[PDB]
């Protein structure tokens, strides 16, 4: 079929080859676990004898030659075009059966795996191919776990190729098992393999899953809903303060979290929108919240450094005043009375805004909303209304958890369904049709 001698006169026993490969796999099938010890030993002895006879007759070289002749073609469609349909839809099955037969031939045989050392380099060169990746991986695993001489030939390029297989095909634990066999075999460690795998796999931090210990972060908000809409009766400008009585910079090995600002809902829904509800995320870790940590402006989980007189991280005896302007979308901060040289603007105004603070353990803070709900340490800018004036006449101003679930007893926990949209927060008087 190759060398441009294509014709229908050629003999290609595809069905015979497939049947013979199935028979060979059944012939070399290892004993099962449920068998008795004596029968298992007898079957293992018979299998080893069969493997030795096949190796002495040089069947591994024949299988390798068949594999090479099959991989001279790019894919099943190419093989179908060159040879015909039956060959086209038998190509992949025949290659997989050949790889299984090779693995069965060399599995558990020290002599066979030692002889396969010379061909190991040729085998690894075709891992990247999707058709033969799994079979080559299984054969390589068998050879490496059986023969130390197999490991004595593995170089830096082969390990790099295996790691590239991880990089290009995804997360496959068989690749990790192959790397473990490369590292250690028969209780003997290989410093070269260990160093190569470490230096070519770990520093990237792009393939293996990364682990880190993260402080739990809770978020708190007043029961105040501020929104801007056409025909609404809500004042555009709002102002509130937070004063930090105490804050421990490092309660644990991770820095203490403390952010202050405004957060938005998702279309008149009372609960905060687009945020994690358990821990690790605070104000400004999404595009629905806007926070200030004393040094940075946080939004979309991205921090930009912002200047202020004697700028520092939020500490004890700090007063942070937050101003929200819904007429022209803007969020501004003042630390200890002096302005913060940064601002949020041109954000979505289709939801409801509320004061919000996020924190890890080790804080003591006080919301000042004005009036009988706190006294402002400074004067709100002209035209800015304090947050306590937004409470509904029936509603009572309260500071509660931003999320639904908090620390309670398991059998007293209130599992909650979806909440009705809070349309009554924004009042739009609707006329009759005319």
């Amino acid at each position: 079929l190759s060398k441009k001698a294509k014709a229908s006169t050629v003999d290609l026993p595809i069905e015979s080859v497939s049947l013979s490969l199935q028979d060979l796999i059944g012939y070399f099938h290892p004993p099962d676990e449920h068998l008795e010890h004596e029968d298992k030993q007898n079957r293992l002895r018979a299998l080893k004898n069969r493997q030795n006879l096949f190796q002495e007759e040089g069947m591994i070289n024949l299988v390798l030659e068949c594999i090479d002749r099959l991989h001279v073609y790019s894919s099943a469609a190419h093989f179908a075009d060159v040879a015909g349909r039956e060959a086209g839809e038998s190509w992949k099955s025949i290659l997989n059966s050949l790889y299984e037969l090779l693995a069965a031939l060399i599995r558990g045989n020290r002599k066979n795996c030692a002889q396969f050392s010379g061909s190991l380099d040729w085998l690894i060169s075709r891992l990247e191919r999707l058709e033969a990746s799994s079979g080559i991986l299984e054969v390589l695993h068998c050879v490496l776990v059986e023969s130390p001489e197999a490991l004595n030939i593995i170089k830096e390029g082969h390990i790099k190729s295996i790691i590239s297989l991880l990089d290009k095909h995804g997360r496959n634990h068989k690749v990790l098992d192959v790397l473990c066999s490369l590292c250690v075999c028969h209780g003997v460690a290989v410093r070269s393999n260990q160093h190569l795998i470490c230096d070519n796999l770990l520093p990237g931090r792009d393939l293996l899953l990364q682990t880190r210990l993260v402080n739990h972060v809770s978020s708190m908000r007043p029961n105040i809903f501020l929104g801007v809409s056409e025909g609404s009766a809500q004042y555009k400008k709002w102002y509130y303060e937070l004063m930090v009585d105490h804050t421990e910079p490092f309660v644990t090995a991770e820095a203490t979290h403390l952010r202050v600002g405004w957060a938005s809902t998702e279309g008149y829904s009372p609960y905060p929108g687009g945020g994690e509800e358990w821990g690790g995320n605070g104000v400004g870790d999404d595009l629905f919240s806007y926070g200030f940590d004393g040094l940075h402006l946080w939004s979309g989980c991205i921090a930009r450094t912002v200047s202020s007189p004697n700028q520092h991280l939020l500490r004890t005896d700090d007063v942070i005043s937050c101003c929200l302007d819904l007429s022209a979308p803007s969020i501004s901060f003042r630390i200890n009375g002096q302005p913060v040289q940064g601002m949020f603007e041109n954000f979505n105004i289709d939801g409801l805004f509320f004061p919000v603070v996020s924190f890890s353990a080790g804080i003591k803070v006080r919301f000042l909303l004005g009036g009988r709900h706190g006294e402002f340490k400074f004067l709100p800018p002209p035209g800015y209304a304090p947050c306590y004036e937004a409470v509904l006449p029936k509603e009572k101003l309260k500071v509660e958890h931003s999320r639904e679930y908090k620390q309670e007893r398991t059998y007293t926990r209130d599992l909650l369904g979806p909440t009705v949209s809070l349309t009554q927060a924004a009042f739009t008087p609707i006329p009759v049709d005319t």
Binding site: D199, P203, A253, A255, T305, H312
Partner: protein
């Protein structure tokens, strides 16, 4: 190549003199934000003598430019941290490093 940003101010008067031993708590981060080292993780203050080639020159200069009791963010470029070779298995080649360093004591 080292640039320093204050986080918590120090005394502003005492600075590491030549031959002194700086005691710090540092947290090491890559430019992407992935932590690679932290003395607070080991729960042991890191002591190093100034000008004696014990630490990387970026950390050296960052600690030199710091007052006692201060907290700072030190960004060190590859040419002042590890160069093109990097640190095998931990820091990739040509990596900019960010250190959160608090100068606890000078001795």
């Amino acid at each position: 190549g080292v640039e320093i940003e204050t986080i918590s101010p120090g005394d502003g008067r005492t600075f590491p003199k030549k031959g002194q031993t700086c005691v710090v708590h540092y947290t090491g981060m890559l430019q992407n934000g992935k932590k690679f080292d932290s003395s607070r993780d080991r729960n042991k203050p890191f002591k190093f003598r100034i000008g004696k080639q014990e630490v990387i020159k970026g950390f050296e200069e960052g600690a030199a430019q710091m007052s006692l009791g201060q907290r700072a963010k030190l960004t060190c470029t590859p040419d002042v941290a590890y160069g093109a070779t990097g640190h095998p298995g931990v820091i990739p080649p040509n990596a900019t490093l960010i250190f959160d360093v608090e100068l606890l004591n000078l001795e």
